[PDB]
């Protein structure tokens, strides 16, 4: 059985040609609405928030592990470097390391926080420890990208990352000072503009994380503040059936214009 909002997510999916999955948690009443919410979705992107999330939770008993310079040498260098090819030979601290990776999308930032955790598996260990049972990362950047159809590697539910980032960025896996960076962090975020922040009122704050890969993949998670009420969390995953379709942030933003209908 389908409600409207699941009725109108089904008639963009169908427009789109693609494979859309949304989940949203209200937390005024801590109900969900899911589309897709249990099939499995490349990250993309979107998995850099666990990484930074690892990281921070590692420096809740290491106080000064934020500010730990970490070397960038010229071999580190992958396929979008924003803000780590202005350190190659030189530095950036793990805190610089998680705001390039979250706010600039920087690939070889990921790689380092990947590294700090001592592989992608230890970002999924982190996953595990505060109750994801769904994420798993298991390649590093750039080829966590490759979005394959079928693949199971480097994916989750929409249900999971949404619960995943409540927790994160409202709950408690983190702590307290833990939690206000990862909200900083994600708020001042530079690529989400045409992404559900395009479809939610501009009065509304929002912290997100996008992702895109092949397949034309396009990814956006986002913890929203409203006017005058409790917060949100939105999770919008796309993916298409052919390689190199193009990518659709559209749908996000169409997505989330549906969403938000009666919020
Ligand atoms: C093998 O890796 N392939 C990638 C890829 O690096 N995706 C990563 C991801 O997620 N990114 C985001 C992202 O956050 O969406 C942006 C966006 O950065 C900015 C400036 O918005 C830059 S690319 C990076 C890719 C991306 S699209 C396509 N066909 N492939």
Same mark, same amino acid.
């Given at each position: 059985q389908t409600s409207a909002v699941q009725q109108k997510l089904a008639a963009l999916e169908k427009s789109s040609g693609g494979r859309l999955g949304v989940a949203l948690i209200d937390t005024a009443d801590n109900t969900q609405v899911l589309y897709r919410g249990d099939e499995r979705?490349?990250?993309? $992107?979107?998995?850099?928030?666990?990484?930074?999330?690892? /990281?921070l939770k590692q420096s809740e008993t290491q106080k000064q592990l934020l500010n730990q310079p970490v070397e960038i040498k010229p071999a580190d260098l992958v396929?979008?470097?924003?803000?780590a090819e202005?350190? /190659?030979? $030189?530095?950036?601290?793990?805190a610089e390391l998680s705001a390039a990776a979250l706010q600039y999308s920087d690939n070889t930032a990921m790689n380092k926080l990947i590294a700090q955790l $001592?592989?992608?598996?230890?970002?999924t260990a982190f996953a595990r420890a505060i109750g994801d049972e769904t994420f798993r990362l298991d390649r590093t950047e750039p080829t966590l990208n490759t979005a394959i159809p079928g693949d199971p590697r480097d994916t989750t539910t929409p249900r999971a990352m949404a619960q995943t980032l409540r927790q994160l960025t409202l709950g408690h896996a983190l702590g307290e000072t833990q939690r206000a960076q990862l909200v900083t962090w994600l708020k001042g975020n530079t690529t989400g503009a045409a992404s559900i922040r395009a479809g939610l009122p501009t009065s509304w704050t929002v912290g997100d994380k996008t992702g895109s890969g092949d397949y034309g993949t396009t990814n956006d998670i986002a913890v929203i503040w409203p006017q005058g009420r409790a917060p949100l969390v939105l999770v919008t995953y796309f993916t298409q059936p052919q390689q190199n379709a193009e990518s659709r942030r559209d749908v996000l933003a169409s997505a989330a214009r549906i969403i938000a209908e009666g919020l």
């Open positions: 979705f490349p990250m993309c $992107g979107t998995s850099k928030v666990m990484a930074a999330a690892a /990281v396929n979008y470097n924003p803000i202005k350190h /190659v030979n $030189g530095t950036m601290t793990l $001592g592989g992608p598996g230890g970002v």
